[PDB]
Amino acid sequence: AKGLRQDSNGKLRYFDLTTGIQAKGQFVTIGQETYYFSKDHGDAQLLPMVTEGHYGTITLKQGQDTKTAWVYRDQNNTILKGLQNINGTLQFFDPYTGEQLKGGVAKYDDKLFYFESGKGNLVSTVAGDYQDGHYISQDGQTRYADKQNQLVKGLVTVNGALQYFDNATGNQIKNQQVIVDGKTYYFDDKGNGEYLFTNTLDMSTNAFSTKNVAFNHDSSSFDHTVDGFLTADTWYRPKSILANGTTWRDSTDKDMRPLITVWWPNKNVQVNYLNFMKANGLLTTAAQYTLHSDQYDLNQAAQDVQVAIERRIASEHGTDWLQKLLFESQNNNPSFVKQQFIWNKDSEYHGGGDAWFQGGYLKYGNNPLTPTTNSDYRQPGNAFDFLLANDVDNSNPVVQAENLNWLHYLMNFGTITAGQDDANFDSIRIDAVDFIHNDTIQRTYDYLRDAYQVQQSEAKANQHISLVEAGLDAGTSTIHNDALIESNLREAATLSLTNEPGKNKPLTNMLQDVDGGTLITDHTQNSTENQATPNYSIIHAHDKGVQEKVGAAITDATGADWTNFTDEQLKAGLELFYKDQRATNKKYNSYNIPSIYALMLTNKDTVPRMYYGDMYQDDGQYMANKSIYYDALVSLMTARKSYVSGGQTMSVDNHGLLKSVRFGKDAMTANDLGTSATRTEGLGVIIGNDPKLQLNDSDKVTLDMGAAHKNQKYRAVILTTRDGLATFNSDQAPTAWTNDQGTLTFSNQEINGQDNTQIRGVANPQVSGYLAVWVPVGASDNQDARTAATTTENHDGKVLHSNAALDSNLIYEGFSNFQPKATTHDELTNVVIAKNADVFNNWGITSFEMAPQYRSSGDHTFLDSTIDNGYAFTDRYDLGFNTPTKYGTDGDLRATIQALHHANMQVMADVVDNQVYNLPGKEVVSATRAGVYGNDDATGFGTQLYVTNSVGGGQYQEKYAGQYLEALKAKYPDLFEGKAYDYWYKNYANDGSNPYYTLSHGDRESIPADVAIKQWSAKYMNGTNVLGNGMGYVLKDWHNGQYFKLDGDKSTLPQ
């Protein structure tokens, strides 16, 4: 007795065709209908299918809260209750409320069944259902005891959640896949369950399936196969073909058929493959195929699909139609492959607190089957690891030799490409310094010590001033002060200034420059030098406090998310953006920008960097549209070049107004007389964040300008007015005197009837509080307040020091993310810069930080590759050859670089060692889900072999990569040897107190010269962003987890 038949007595039962077992207490799908058979003696029960039905939501308050419940309801508003059969799946609804049950259990024929978290289809029999009982901890394990003191074993629901416990011991399984009655479930690090896919039974190779076996294990018989692994998109060559669904004939070498028509990874896929064919008229049948259908029926069904297929192949004398059917998209829907859970992003489990960008990451690992993509290293060696794209493994010796080789290329770009020596870069900027290994950072600085001797003297250090994207947390950097780091000014400004009226904290935070507890510099009484940490102050940058905020206007009146959009949508955004920026009340923009630039450009012990986007607007081309802040900013820069020097003394009086002041070259405190040049130097700033401020007639605000400035005339540089700020670049401006002491006394009245000299609250586009800058009258036409860096020898092993000489420098971040693409050669950014070389030198810019000049991948994966700023690149050696980059060609870059050298500036090469975008070539590697911190994530993806987009490069990487290494090892052999070093390490205190730094120790290995990364591959990467291929993309026998591989002694699936 096997199949559906009725016995001697009344009614009908069911028997497994395969085994012979009677179905009782189970679900089976026999031909058309789906049934349930009873616990009693298996007498059956019909579950009619529901075609046509609304599917919606209602409100129900049971007792506590009004919940909004989901319901099915048929066409006719009758809300369907109890167990129902819907599209050949079984979902369950509460018969009282009508609510859909998904991720839970239900009593049905004194038997508890479970429904998946997702769609809420019936997948398996659950063992026990517990609200009574409690947890226990025994032997360092976790377990669960019933109400009656005894243990629970196996798969049960504990307090509404699904969980599982070892059948022998009762140990709760955690962070592991496990099979229960052929169903694979995943249980998280906490222990809570989730269904994945029902596994097939896998039966004996019969008459028919004999001839669908693979012709041989050679490579020729298979295709679409990365590194010898079978993917879902693999076509194979059978031993024989069923010509026209009739004549079995030996297969020829030109014959191929798709693996997914004969083999499947789980029963889910197989059931969906059949019902898919039913839809597209390759299997005309009144039969219905569910997760409860007999394997025999499903496999027989799979053979009838081939019969019908082979007809259509015979007809069309080819198989391009099928390729199109299974693998390409149909009727604006995902393809058949992608529809499947095991072959899409849904089984990758994207997102999570730790997954900052592109929905998380995939940390590569090692595996016997994949000896090409295996790596001994892949250690992060820094606070963070993964950020974007394909994270490059910088712990690797060959990658460290390649990072030097690229450095040397950039540092000698002119000399290499065009034989032009004045066309080279001088300084660098390490992009994402906390995201790359310290070894290559250490080794990077060593190159700059070896090639330019920056440690020797501050004259040589200052000519090649480099900097990073980090605070004190970049330990390798701060240890010997090899580069500048970002001050806390930006943050400090963000609380006490950049917010709207009423949401601004007091300006006492701006007195000191502290990076979470540790002090960077204290402006209160800054009289000494060579003390503070070499740093750079900013308020905006290409990415910091802009992309966030610009995006804001883009999405409103446009809706496109900030990572991908059309040029039109961008242009429409920026319109509203700049249209808000010029207003008094600013939704998307920041307040008091000039006041903030005033601080940056007057504060001691910092090298401020100007942001292009604050002076010019991106609605127009490069240096095309001036911003509202332009005049204000140009004046302050001009003030700095001529006046700002000497010591600093900043305070906040009782009225709430910052009073920064500088005393001039030589003079370090308010009592110091100083040299004759001091008299016409040093300015005084007054700032305020109360636009509703109104001092009364008795109130007096003062600026003690110092003992050098007794009885001297002082003229305004910047003055707050009703409409904005009255700028002044010359002694032609309102003036005011100091008393016998040396003190500019102001008040709510005008100074000698000079309008706009009085102190008061004001609300206007360029300032929401008060801003006034004052310098001494009688400056020379060619005065300079800047101190020239000594050729003086340094023995203390520091590179950069904070002194007059360094504070004389002024960096310029000369690009934006949201520039439009030029329409002509003249409108391109690197030509414009070359034209306007003197315009920067006049403002007193010393360092000019260009945009990474690398060809963008233009894959619209992330913002950086949407708007093509140059951080998103494949060939990192291509700086605009042949076809231009956003900024220019390689000819235009060399023209720019020389234009800056001729205008006495240094040029910064922005170095991105972290990641690389869009590498077309494919490889198989073991990947596991991870977060920025290079940490394993507890996901149902687990650890799988994944086809990653890791092989690639470009024409110019082939050419240049690795080539200058043997050169370099000759000249500077110390770069290539091993080396011990020290670096700081930020510790976060658990008790909610301030962090603290501790000296850590490091040892970089030696590196090779001979080995060259001509192109990238898996083995030189730490990992890759989630690609969305799927958990089961590299195919494997999910019963036992054996991967398929093509060797002489292959592990073939068609078997």
- Binding positions for Ca(2+): 385, 391, 435, 914
How many Cβ atoms from other residues are within 10 Å of residue 951's Cβ?
Answer: 16
Using the contact rule CB under 5 A, the part of the chain among 24-32, 301-309, 379-387, 656-664 near Ca ion is 379-387
Using the contact rule CB under 5 A, the part of the chain among 237-245, 356-364, 385-393, 789-797 near Ca ion is 385-393
Using the contact rule CB under 5 A, the part of the chain among 165-173, 386-394, 692-700, 974-982 near Ca ion is 386-394
CA dihedral 796, 800, 806, 807 (to 10 degrees): -100
Q: Residue 355 CB, nearest distance to Ca ion (Å)? A: 15
C-beta of 72 vs 361, nearer to Ca ion: 361
Distance (Å, whole) CA 439 – CA 395: 7
Nearest to 158 by CA among 132, 137, 181: 132
State the pairing for strand pair 3-5/13-15. antiparallel
Q: Residue 351 CB, nearest distance to Ca ion (Å)? A: 21
Q: Residue 958 CB, nearest distance to Ca ion (Å)? A: 24
3-state DSSP assignment of residue 688: strand
Nearest to 964 by CA among 522, 201, 405, 576: 405
3-state DSSP assignment of residue 314: helix
Q: What's the burial of 140, exposed, middle or buried (CB within 10 Å: 0-12/13-18/19+)?
A: exposed
Integer CA distances (angstroms), 628 to 717, 820, 1032, in order = 17, 19, 55
According to CB under 5 A, which residues from 190 to 219 bind Ca ion?
none
Q: Residue 914 CB, nearest distance to Ca ion (Å)? A: 5
The one among 391, 513, 631, 910 contacting Ca ion by CB under 5 A: 391
Using the contact rule CB under 5 A, the part of the chain among 279-287, 384-392, 505-513, 638-646 near Ca ion is 384-392
CB-facing half-sphere around the CA of 73: CA atoms within 13 A: 16
The crossing angle, in degrees rounded to 10, of helices 489-496 and 593-600 is 150
Binding status of residue 116 toward Ca ion by CB under 5 A: no
Please state the length of the chain: 1055
Nearest to 126 by CA among 92, 155, 153: 155
Q: Residue 1021 CB, nearest distance to Ca ion (Å)? A: 9
C-beta of 385 vs 910, nearer to Ca ion: 385
Distance (Å, whole) CA 398 – CA 1011: 7
Distance (Å, whole) CA 389 – CA 631: 40
One-character DSSP codes across 908-966: EEEE--SEE----EEEEEEEEEE-TTS-B---TT-EEEEEEEEEB--HHHHHHTTTTHH
Q: Residue 912 CB, nearest distance to Ca ion (Å)? A: 11
C-beta of 361 vs 984, nearer to Ca ion: 361
Site string for Ca ion, 428-467 (x = CB under 5 A): -------xx-------------------------------
3-state DSSP assignment of residue 708: helix
Q: Residue 500 CB, nearest distance to Ca ion (Å)? A: 38
Distance (Å, whole) CA 524 – CA 929: 49
C-beta of 436 vs 532, nearer to Ca ion: 436
Q: Residue 846 CB, nearest distance to Ca ion (Å)? A: 31
According to CB under 5 A, which residues from 138 to 177 bind Ca ion?
none
Q: Residue 968 CB, nearest distance to Ca ion (Å)? A: 23
DSSP annotation of 1035: -
Distance (Å, whole) CA 1018 – CA 925: 7
Q: Residue 385 CB, nearest distance to Ca ion (Å)? A: 5
Q: Residue 395 CB, nearest distance to Ca ion (Å)? A: 9
C-beta of 404 vs 1031, nearer to Ca ion: 404
C-beta of 775 vs 1007, nearer to Ca ion: 1007
Q: Residue 919 CB, nearest distance to Ca ion (Å)? A: 16
Q: Residue 375 CB, nearest distance to Ca ion (Å)? A: 13
In sequence order, the 6+-apart residues with CB closer than 8 A to the CB of 781 are none
C-beta of 435 vs 728, nearer to Ca ion: 435
C-beta of 385 vs 469, nearer to Ca ion: 385
Task: Report the residue number whose CB is nearest to Ca ion.
Answer: 391
- Ramachandran class of 856: left when φ > 0, alpha when ψ lies in -120 to 50, beta otherwise: beta
C-beta of 198 vs 918, nearer to Ca ion: 918
C-beta of 436 vs 811, nearer to Ca ion: 436
C-beta of 186 vs 854, nearer to Ca ion: 854
Q: Which residue has the tokens 């391109």?
A: 828
Amino acid at 758: Q
C-beta of 310 vs 393, nearer to Ca ion: 393
Q: What angle do CA 651, 590, 866 make, to 5 degrees?
A: 135
According to CB under 5 A, which residues from 57 to 96 bind Ca ion?
none
Distance (Å, whole) CA 748 – CA 417: 63
Amino acid at 620: G
C-beta of 106 vs 872, nearer to Ca ion: 872
Q: Residue 929 CB, nearest distance to Ca ion (Å)? A: 17
Site string for Ca ion, 956-975 (x = CB under 5 A): --------------------
Tell how far CA 480 is from the center of its chain: 30
C-beta of 435 vs 881, nearer to Ca ion: 435
Distance (Å, whole) CA 338 – CA 346: 10
3-state DSSP assignment of residue 633: helix
According to CB under 5 A, which residues from 635 to 694 bind Ca ion?
none
Q: Which residue has the tokens 């005339």?
A: 713
- 963, 1012 contact by CB (below 8 A): yes
Distance (Å, whole) CA 169 – CA 154: 10
Binding site feature residues: 385, 391, 435, 914
Q: Residue 151 CB, nearest distance to Ca ion (Å)? A: 46
Nearest to 771 by CA among 605, 609, 602: 602
Size of site (CB under 5 A) for Ca ion:
4
C-beta of 438 vs 819, nearer to Ca ion: 438
Integer CA distances (angstroms), 831 to 413, 813, 868, 869, 890, in order = 18, 16, 18, 16, 11
Using the contact rule CB under 5 A, the part of the chain among 367-375, 388-396, 725-733, 925-933 near Ca ion is 388-396
The helix or strand, by DSSP H or E, that contains position 29, with its residue range, turns out to be: strand 27-30
Binding site for Ca ion (CB under 5 A): 385, 391, 435-436
